[PDB]
């Protein structure tokens, strides 16, 4: 019992964090094998005016780098641009490199943030990629390079390196190929985020877990058709639901059909009536059906 936005254990990722310092800039890097990845704006002279990243790279002096994992200091053999990231070849292999892949996450998918400061893991929390391709994190200045990751069957799937902030709960990274999520730029310019839409599939996972956990007061005694709901959704900040198939397993443990929850969503949208649901007073799309099943059942 209990639903908690949690994080997978950070142990295997913790040993891959380095401090990457260039001139007076310092941030975090990810050190895998003999390569360190980190945001390229560590070689910028100032993050207040537009940056010619190609220029900074051409005038870059290797000896100006100081990369360290604790007091293991890493010699820099080479530097290449990888989109919004720098691919730095170092003279030592990280012997604690886990088995890993890279994967670009899509909106509505959950992953873990290992929030890092001055090259050291500071904390860990779960996040969910919003439809405007930002995450609701807690990064201060100097947290750039913090990795996002999932763990499946002993493999670490890296999906995120923190890059920038464009609002209070609004954080943007690149995947490990260097592609900025949402196509935002790593420039101190006027960019604003796109509007967000609640991932209806995730909200339904949340409300199922609410029922499983004995919270039922909000459950509608009406029903709305998926097609009907989808026409309502595009006008009230919610994604359409495409496959009702994955909730078959949930509608057994409870005697509640999707169409019942979908009517509940419409009233709960913009109102919980003074009450809460598992601590929440507003619809959350941070939980996927996978997350919820893992937490209630271990399957």
């Amino acid at each position: 019992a209990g639903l908690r936005k949690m994080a997978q254990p950070s142990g295997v990722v913790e040993k891959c964090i380095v401090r990457v310092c260039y001139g007076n800039m310092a941030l975090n890097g990810l050190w895998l094998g003999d390569t360190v990845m980190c945001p390229r704006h560590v070689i910028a002279s100032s993050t207040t005016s537009t940056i010619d990243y190609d220029y900074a790279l051409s005038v870059l002096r290797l000896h100006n780098f100081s990369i360290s994992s604790g007091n293991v200091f890493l010699g820099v053999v080479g530097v290449t641009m990888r989109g919004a990231l720098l691919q730095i070849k170092v003279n030592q292999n990280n012997v604690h490199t886990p088995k890993y892949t890279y994967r670009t996450v899509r909106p509505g998918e959950s992953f873990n943030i290992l929030a890092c400061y001055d090259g050291a893991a500071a904390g860990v929390y779960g996040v969910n990629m919003r439809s405007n391709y930002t995450i609701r994190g807690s990064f201060i200045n100097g947290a750039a390079g913090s990795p996002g990751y999932n763990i499946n069957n002993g493999t670490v799937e890296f999906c995120y390196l923190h890059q920038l902030e464009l609002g209070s709960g609004c954080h943007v990274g690149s995947d490990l190929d260097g592609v900025m999520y949402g196509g935002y730029e790593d420039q101190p310019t006027l960019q604003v985020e796109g509007a967000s839409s609640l991932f209806t599939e995730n909200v339904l996972a949340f409300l199922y877990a609410a029922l499983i956990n004995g919270s039922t007061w909000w459950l509608s005694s009406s029903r709305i058709a998926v097609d009907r709901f989808n026409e309502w959704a595009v006008h009230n900040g919610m994604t359409t639901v495409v496959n009702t198939d994955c909730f078959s397993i949930f509608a057994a443990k409870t005697g509640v059909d999707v169409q019942r929850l979908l009517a509940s969503i419409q009233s709960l949208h913009k109102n919980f009536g003074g009450k809460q649901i598992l601590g929440y007073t507003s619809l959350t799309d941070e939980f996927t059906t996978g997350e919820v099943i893992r937490q209630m059942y271990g399957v």
């Binding site: 941030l27 923190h162 101190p188």
Partner: peptide, 4 residues
């Protein structure tokens, strides 16, 4: 934007 803030480059963190």
């Amino acid at each position: 934007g803030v480059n963190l």
